Design an enzyme around this catalytic site. Sequence first.
Site, PDB file in Angstrom:
ATOM      1  N   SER A 125       0.636  -1.348  -0.103  1.00  0.00           N
ATOM      2  CA  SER A 125      -0.074   0.002   0.068  1.00  0.00           C
ATOM      3  C   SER A 125       0.800   1.332  -0.074  1.00  0.00           C
ATOM      4  CB  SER A 125      -0.958  -0.241   1.126  1.00  0.00           C
ATOM      5  OG  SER A 125      -2.079   1.074   1.302  1.00  0.00           O
ATOM      6  N   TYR A 177      -4.353   2.490  -9.997  1.00  0.00           N
ATOM      7  CA  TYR A 177      -5.553   3.315 -10.002  1.00  0.00           C
ATOM      8  C   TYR A 177      -5.927   3.529 -11.713  1.00  0.00           C
ATOM      9  CZ  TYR A 177      -7.882   7.933 -10.384  1.00  0.00           C
ATOM     10  OH  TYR A 177      -8.859   8.823 -10.795  1.00  0.00           O
ATOM     11  N   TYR A 187      -3.092  13.206 -13.028  1.00  0.00           N
ATOM     12  CA  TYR A 187      -2.401  11.960 -12.394  1.00  0.00           C
ATOM     13  C   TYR A 187      -0.988  11.776 -13.078  1.00  0.00           C
ATOM     14  CZ  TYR A 187      -2.150   7.259  -9.901  1.00  0.00           C
ATOM     15  OH  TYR A 187      -1.298   6.438  -9.369  1.00  0.00           O
TER      16      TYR A 187
HETATM   17  N1  NAD Z   1      -5.833   7.497  -2.012  1.00  0.00           N
HETATM   18  C1  NAD Z   1      -6.486   7.044  -3.088  1.00  0.00           C
HETATM   19  O1  NAD Z   1      -7.113   7.845  -3.716  1.00  0.00           O
HETATM   20  C2  NAD Z   1      -5.919   6.220  -4.113  1.00  0.00           C
HETATM   21  C3  NAD Z   1      -6.603   5.757  -5.134  1.00  0.00           C
HETATM   22  C4  NAD Z   1      -6.048   4.696  -6.014  1.00  0.00           C
HETATM   23  C5  NAD Z   1      -4.791   4.003  -5.357  1.00  0.00           C
HETATM   24  N2  NAD Z   1      -4.413   4.332  -4.328  1.00  0.00           N
HETATM   25  C6  NAD Z   1      -3.101   3.980  -3.838  1.00  0.00           C
HETATM   26  O2  NAD Z   1      -3.199   3.158  -2.414  1.00  0.00           O
HETATM   27  C7  NAD Z   1      -1.867   3.133  -1.988  1.00  0.00           C
HETATM   28  C8  NAD Z   1      -1.896   3.594  -0.688  1.00  0.00           C
HETATM   29  O3  NAD Z   1      -2.155   5.269  -1.044  1.00  0.00           O
HETATM   30  P1  NAD Z   1      -2.993   5.998  -0.073  1.00  0.00           P
HETATM   31  O4  NAD Z   1      -3.931   6.911  -0.665  1.00  0.00           O
HETATM   32  O5  NAD Z   1      -3.551   4.969   1.187  1.00  0.00           O
HETATM   33  O6  NAD Z   1      -1.754   6.997   0.623  1.00  0.00           O
HETATM   34  P2  NAD Z   1      -1.157   7.122   2.278  1.00  0.00           P
HETATM   35  O7  NAD Z   1      -1.532   8.256   2.612  1.00  0.00           O
HETATM   36  O8  NAD Z   1      -1.581   5.778   2.882  1.00  0.00           O
HETATM   37  O9  NAD Z   1       0.353   6.747   1.855  1.00  0.00           O
HETATM   38  C9  NAD Z   1       1.152   6.262   0.602  1.00  0.00           C
HETATM   39  C10 NAD Z   1       2.083   5.658   1.467  1.00  0.00           C
HETATM   40  O10 NAD Z   1       3.212   5.021   0.988  1.00  0.00           O
HETATM   41  C11 NAD Z   1       4.431   5.332   1.894  1.00  0.00           C
HETATM   42  N3  NAD Z   1       5.728   5.530   0.979  1.00  0.00           N
HETATM   43  C12 NAD Z   1       6.065   6.571   0.163  1.00  0.00           C
HETATM   44  N4  NAD Z   1       7.342   6.369  -0.336  1.00  0.00           N
HETATM   45  C13 NAD Z   1       7.677   4.998   0.213  1.00  0.00           C
HETATM   46  C14 NAD Z   1       8.975   4.511   0.297  1.00  0.00           C
HETATM   47  N5  NAD Z   1       9.956   4.664  -0.402  1.00  0.00           N
HETATM   48  N6  NAD Z   1       8.946   3.296   1.255  1.00  0.00           N
HETATM   49  C15 NAD Z   1       8.005   2.993   2.053  1.00  0.00           C
HETATM   50  N7  NAD Z   1       6.817   3.469   1.861  1.00  0.00           N
HETATM   51  C16 NAD Z   1       6.725   4.811   1.233  1.00  0.00           C
HETATM   52  C17 NAD Z   1       4.046   6.477   3.059  1.00  0.00           C
HETATM   53  O11 NAD Z   1       4.531   5.885   4.200  1.00  0.00           O
HETATM   54  C18 NAD Z   1       2.606   6.321   2.943  1.00  0.00           C
HETATM   55  O12 NAD Z   1       2.093   5.565   4.020  1.00  0.00           O
HETATM   56  C19 NAD Z   1      -0.903   3.702  -3.086  1.00  0.00           C
HETATM   57  O13 NAD Z   1       0.027   2.861  -3.586  1.00  0.00           O
HETATM   58  C20 NAD Z   1      -1.885   4.342  -4.230  1.00  0.00           C
HETATM   59  O14 NAD Z   1      -1.040   4.219  -5.269  1.00  0.00           O
HETATM   60  C21 NAD Z   1      -4.638   5.429  -3.467  1.00  0.00           C
HETATM   61  O1  TCL Z   2      -2.039   6.451  -7.024  1.00  0.00           O
HETATM   62  C1  TCL Z   2      -3.089   7.094  -6.381  1.00  0.00           C
HETATM   63  C2  TCL Z   2      -4.247   7.627  -7.066  1.00  0.00           C
HETATM   64  C3  TCL Z   2      -5.058   8.625  -6.498  1.00  0.00           C
HETATM   65 CL1  TCL Z   2      -6.654   8.993  -7.180  1.00  0.00          CL
HETATM   66  C4  TCL Z   2      -4.993   9.300  -5.002  1.00  0.00           C
HETATM   67  C5  TCL Z   2      -3.672   8.826  -4.558  1.00  0.00           C
HETATM   68  C6  TCL Z   2      -2.718   7.978  -5.012  1.00  0.00           C
HETATM   69  O2  TCL Z   2      -1.536   7.505  -4.339  1.00  0.00           O
HETATM   70  C7  TCL Z   2      -0.492   8.484  -4.600  1.00  0.00           C
HETATM   71  C8  TCL Z   2      -0.418   9.554  -5.503  1.00  0.00           C
HETATM   72  C9  TCL Z   2       0.671  10.160  -5.785  1.00  0.00           C
HETATM   73  C10 TCL Z   2       1.853   9.979  -4.778  1.00  0.00           C
HETATM   74 CL2  TCL Z   2       3.257  10.661  -5.022  1.00  0.00          CL
HETATM   75  C11 TCL Z   2       1.599   8.996  -3.731  1.00  0.00           C
HETATM   76  C12 TCL Z   2       0.491   8.305  -3.513  1.00  0.00           C
HETATM   77 CL3  TCL Z   2       0.314   7.064  -2.423  1.00  0.00          CL
END
Ligand code: NAD
Ligand code: TCL
Lengths: 302, 303, 303, 302
Positions: A125, A177, A187
């Site tokens: 994650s 995503y 993005y």
């Molecule tokens: N939030 C969204 O809308 C969304 C949508 C689609 C996908 N995602 C995905 O879900 C995953 C988690 O995202 P989120 O929204 O929960 O973000 P989040 O706020 O939980 O944080 C992203 C995490 O990755 C970590 N990180 C960044 N660089 C790192 C590294 N080098 N080593 C170890 N950890 C590192 C941070 O500690 C953080 O906990 C991401 O991979 C993202 O691509 C998020």
């Molecule tokens: O992949 C993602 C997609 C969406 Cl819609 C929202 C957050 C997401 O997560 C990230 C997007 C950019 C960076 Cl720098 C780090 C993270 Cl964890």
Amino acid sequence: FPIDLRGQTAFVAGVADSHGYGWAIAKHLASAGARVALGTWPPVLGLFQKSLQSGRLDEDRKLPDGSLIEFAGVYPLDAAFDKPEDVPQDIKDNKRYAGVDGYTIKEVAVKVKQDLGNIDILVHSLANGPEVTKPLLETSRKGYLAASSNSAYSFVSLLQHFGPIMNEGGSAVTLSYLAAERVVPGYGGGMSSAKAALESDTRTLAWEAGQKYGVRVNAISAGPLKSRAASAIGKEKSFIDYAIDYSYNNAPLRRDLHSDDVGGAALFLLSPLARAVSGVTLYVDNGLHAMGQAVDSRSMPP
Amino acid sequence: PIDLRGQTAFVAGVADSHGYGWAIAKHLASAGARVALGTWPPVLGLFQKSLQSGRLDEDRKLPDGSLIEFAGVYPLDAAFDKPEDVPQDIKDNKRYAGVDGYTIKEVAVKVKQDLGNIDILVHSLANGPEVTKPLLETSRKGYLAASSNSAYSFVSLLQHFGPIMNEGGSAVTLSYLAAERVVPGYGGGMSSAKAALESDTRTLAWEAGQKYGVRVNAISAGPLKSRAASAIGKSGEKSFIDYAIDYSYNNAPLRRDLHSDDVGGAALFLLSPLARAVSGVTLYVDNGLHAMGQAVDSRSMPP
Amino acid sequence: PIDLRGQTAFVAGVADSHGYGWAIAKHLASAGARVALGTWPPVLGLFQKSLQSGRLDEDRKLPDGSLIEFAGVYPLDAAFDKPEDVPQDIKDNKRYAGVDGYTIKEVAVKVKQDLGNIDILVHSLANGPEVTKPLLETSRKGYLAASSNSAYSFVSLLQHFGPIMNEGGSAVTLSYLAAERVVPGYGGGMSSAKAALESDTRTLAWEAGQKYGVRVNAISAGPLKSRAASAIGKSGEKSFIDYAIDYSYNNAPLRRDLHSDDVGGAALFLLSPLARAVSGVTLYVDNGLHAMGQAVDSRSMPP
Amino acid sequence: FPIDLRGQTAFVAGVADSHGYGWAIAKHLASAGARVALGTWPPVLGLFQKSLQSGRLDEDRKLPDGSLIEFAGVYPLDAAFDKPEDVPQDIKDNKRYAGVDGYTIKEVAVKVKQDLGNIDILVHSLANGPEVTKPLLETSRKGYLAASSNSAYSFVSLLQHFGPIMNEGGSAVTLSYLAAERVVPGYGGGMSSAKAALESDTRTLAWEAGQKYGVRVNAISAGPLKSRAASAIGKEKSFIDYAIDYSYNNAPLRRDLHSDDVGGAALFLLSPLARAVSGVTLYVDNGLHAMGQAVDSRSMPP
Ligand SMILES: NC(=O)c1ccc[n+]([C@@H]2O[C@H](COP(=O)([O-])OP(=O)(O)OC[C@H]3O[C@@H](n4cnc5c(N)ncnc54)[C@H](O)[C@@H]3O)[C@@H](O)[C@H]2O)c1
Ligand SMILES: Oc1cc(Cl)ccc1Oc1ccc(Cl)cc1Cl
Ligand SMILES: NC(=O)c1ccc[n+]([C@@H]2O[C@H](COP(=O)([O-])OP(=O)(O)OC[C@H]3O[C@@H](n4cnc5c(N)ncnc54)[C@H](O)[C@@H]3O)[C@@H](O)[C@H]2O)c1
Ligand SMILES: NC(=O)c1ccc[n+]([C@@H]2O[C@H](COP(=O)([O-])OP(=O)(O)OC[C@H]3O[C@@H](n4cnc5c(N)ncnc54)[C@H](O)[C@@H]3O)[C@@H](O)[C@H]2O)c1
Ligand SMILES: NC(=O)c1ccc[n+]([C@@H]2O[C@H](COP(=O)([O-])OP(=O)(O)OC[C@H]3O[C@@H](n4cnc5c(N)ncnc54)[C@H](O)[C@@H]3O)[C@@H](O)[C@H]2O)c1
Ligand SMILES: Oc1cc(Cl)ccc1Oc1ccc(Cl)cc1Cl
Ligand SMILES: Oc1cc(Cl)ccc1Oc1ccc(Cl)cc1Cl
Ligand SMILES: Oc1cc(Cl)ccc1Oc1ccc(Cl)cc1Cl
């Protein structure tokens, strides 16, 4: 008894706080009887630890029956580094890492193997795109490669180092995503690109890891959620805020996407109920993926 | 954990204990759903007797040691929507003697009557008379039948159950990979009708999601020797399905026996509050076969 | 008919007559394009000599009986954008002695200088040092290299050529099926980097389509024994690629030898006004292999 | 010489006028040296014939060099009927069919074989959804099955009856819409459904026909175009008009989609330049397929 993970142990890479999808997955996994260990990015480990011992997150830890989530370990983890020789001097120097060692993927695997034994459940994650706010025409080799390195190779490395310590019938989930498959403006920074590779590699790993360890490998493509990493894009009103609205207005299910929604789905993909499920990109996005057209477009009428 | 107490489901396309419909029913019940069944009238009698005898009690045992009981077993022909659509030959067909009120509209009414609004709907039925025939040797009458029985049935089923479905309810159907890529021997335009079925899952997920706040999903399953699969290619020898299972076992990421429970549980999820942000998807429950771009045991290739 | 007179193309990734890059170049020319080439500096000398000798004149003959002539052959390393990105080892590398101005920015400038705005851009290059290694045995340094050489190169190439590209111009790149489904032996994260490449084709088709009115497409090709394919798995025996070709020949809808011209012509279309409503696509040029959901010559299966 | 179809003969099912994609394909095929025969729906054959002999379509026939398109035959063809025994009495009765015989797919194949010999190129440019303006929840078994029968089985039947008279290396094209893969509101009546099956069957046929006759089988998913069949949905301002705007505003290429754009693409898929191309859905839609998000949504800003 329909999902029952007692006995099993899970490792969730990428939990710095209670607002991301990682927290929610860990919450549900734990909610189902699993031992749950976290890997946490070192610069933010200090504040997270504080958060937890302060009782400031005791609300977000409330399991349905009032009990609080225990974590069976919270490991420094920078998934941009596979092993000690890879970490630059300026990072070992960097104040923020000063305090903890053993934070490369090889070292965290090793720590976990002997502190906890073999694991069952692996959760990825985490992503990091230095240049996420730049469109592709404006992203540099270095920023693109970093987004790949942080957000896609990280997964391969994890499987490479955890699969050896994973029980047969284990399972692993990562998070993509829609940008991976289809164009999403805003993005940028090679993140779309990296997610596409994360999906490709979820398939290849399902094969390589299916045959070598009998471990399943799946992805969830998830909808927008105001995590802290998501608020930092555009760092006023911004990428994620518009994402959330667009999906509210255009998805088959008109409802708020809650971090737990991905949590539940993760639980399934990491449970025995999914023993025949591997290589999959599972959409948890209120059905947005299924549309070929906006229904709130200016180009028609309301 | 996941908890379906208070919820009612109708699973359409259950005549034996060997079907994916059975396994799904068995999983809704073990999560505490009320499960009413839909059974094709021609085989309803033999099905009723199988339960009633005790022949299925092995197949009926849930995790807690008890036995799945059904909350009504309804005669159902998904080829028909209304009693005006049933032709004279079937009215006076000996296989259909005794059974009444089996069109989709009527079953949905009695289900409303006898049980009230449902929460969960399963579409686990298919039929294509010319399935053994490749597409180049398939007729309009038989291809259209395949679509009628296996695709439209799901549309009508949602149309006629949607209104009596609670906000946040689920429907799921069952497809096979052939809808996206060519699987030889999967003929009679079953391939065609499964692609239609998958498309409708998306379109209905929109339609039913906007109107009823109902979710609609599809599990694309791998090979299982159910009664209907055994009937394909039928001689008395190693059939279409035997080769499907062998192939999958030899080419899927997970070297494994696919059991009807594997889908039972995949579906359980999709019809449960765990899946409340999931709709319009095609979830491969196939030991990962779908992800492969190449068979590993090809004779072009070395072991 | 389709007519490319007046138009200029830069085809990147041409060192021999055995590549898909060659065949594409040969087809742009036969439609009357001006074709300038991009060649990796380490092999530029041996390539120049091959043309200059007359060894390639067979491979050079176009339909009209004449011989493709190129409008400049540029040294090009797509791993580098700018001359500051080139490290000392390469500056003082014996393979790179004599050659100057080969980073992407610089080549795009000389191409602007020497020829003016181009109409057509081909990306026909890839490199992944650990291609023989499965993903579970692939390193960050090598996987990142695979992405650097095979995916980002296309992004930089568009970035640095886009401005000197005419409204309604085309760029196309080359992928392999492994980006969507698992192809064993296609390792080193080449699979990963081709998926990235395909995704970028879509994203750039948007970006470059909106800014420049340039089209951007991808041909997903089937197996061909080019020089680079021969190098995979290299011993001196029947290699990864030999098995790919055999497999395809035995499992594709069209039982056929895939020739580099087959892609030559598919690409020609994509880079021609015939394709002016086509952008962001992945066109399978693979004898229909992609459409299959099952190998026909499996050892699970009878002949 | 880059595309050169002299010698070859093509049959284009579904040309009633100069405004549909069928006309454009036929126009380009002919433009490349091919003999081009049309199959035309009987009720509208009379008016089409008139149109052609009246000189009223001499503009739309102008090939680039001023020459006019010749058609090597214009055949009555109702692709809802495979063979004579299938045509109801009320259709043979129907005034509009009164005049011509031999209009089932089996009979047109047979007519073409002996009038022209073996063919090279087969084009399927025809659909009919009785209930297209009804959403799926409101479409009846009969309307759904008719849309399938008219718009998808029609293709299988054509291949079934023309493949025997098709040269090895022949090619065949049909035409889908994005609704097949992703939800498009307004495209109802089981048409989405049927197109999905048309795409599936393009794949299965590529296999069955690749092996049996060495004939390629491909599809074009095409963007919105104000053909006459397209104007009749909603029969004021209507499905197609909004479709055209939505795509103008949201596609990677901002340009008008012209019937010839599909024409060119068809020419390719039916030419020797595509000898290794089969089973494909080729998008001719200004790139609309590639987007995961509207860029003119109310839910953001302009
Ligand atoms: N939030 C969204 O809308 C969304 C949508 C689609 C996908 N995602 C995905 O879900 C995953 C988690 O995202 P989120 O929204 O929960 O973000 P989040 O706020 O939980 O944080 C992203 C995490 O990755 C970590 N990180 C960044 N660089 C790192 C590294 N080098 N080593 C170890 N950890 C590192 C941070 O500690 C953080 O906990 C991401 O991979 C993202 O691509 C998020
Ligand atoms: O992949 C993602 C997609 C969406 Cl819609 C929202 C957050 C997401 O997560 C990230 C997007 C950019 C960076 Cl720098 C780090 C993270 Cl964890
Ligand atoms: N068995 C497999 O390998 C497999 C693989 C993929 C998908 N499926 C799908 O799963 C579903 C369940 O079938 P199954 O394989 O479990 O075997 P099954 O024997 O349980 O399925 C057939 C059932 O559907 C019913 N049925 C058939 N025609 C009907 C009609 N016209 N009206 C009403 N009911 C009718 C029958 O009563 C029978 O119970 C099918 O839709 C099928 O397409 C099965
Ligand atoms: N041959 C096949 O079977 C096949 C199949 C699918 C896709 N492809 C793709 O088609 C493209 C063309 O390769 P090919 O198979 O025709 O063989 P090729 O030998 O023509 O391709 C390699 C060429 O790319 C160049 N190159 C390699 N690394 C480079 C770098 N770092 N910087 C600049 N140039 C570099 C070399 O000069 C060489 O000419 C590749 O991108 C490949 O991914 C090939
Ligand atoms: N126009 C568009 O925007 C668009 C977009 C995507 C796909 N298409 C497709 O392209 C194809 C042609 O559409 P168009 O827009 O050019 O329409 P069009 O106006 O050319 O006419 C459709 C044709 O099908 C015919 N037809 C209907 N029922 C028939 C039958 N039973 N037998 C024989 N012919 C019958 C008519 O003669 C008519 O020529 C259609 O298949 C459609 O699905 C059109
Ligand atoms: O869809 C299926 C796919 C597979 Cl591999 C096996 C069985 C399937 O299901 C059917 C196939 C044909 C008929 Cl007539 C009826 C049914 Cl229930
Ligand atoms: O992408 C490809 C796919 C195939 Cl089947 C064959 C060759 C290919 O092209 C390459 C593969 C590996 C390396 Cl190192 C370089 C190149 Cl040009
Ligand atoms: O498939 C289509 C898609 C679009 Cl956007 C426009 C027209 C199309 O073509 C048709 C739609 C409905 C009917 Cl009844 C007949 C035809 Cl030919």
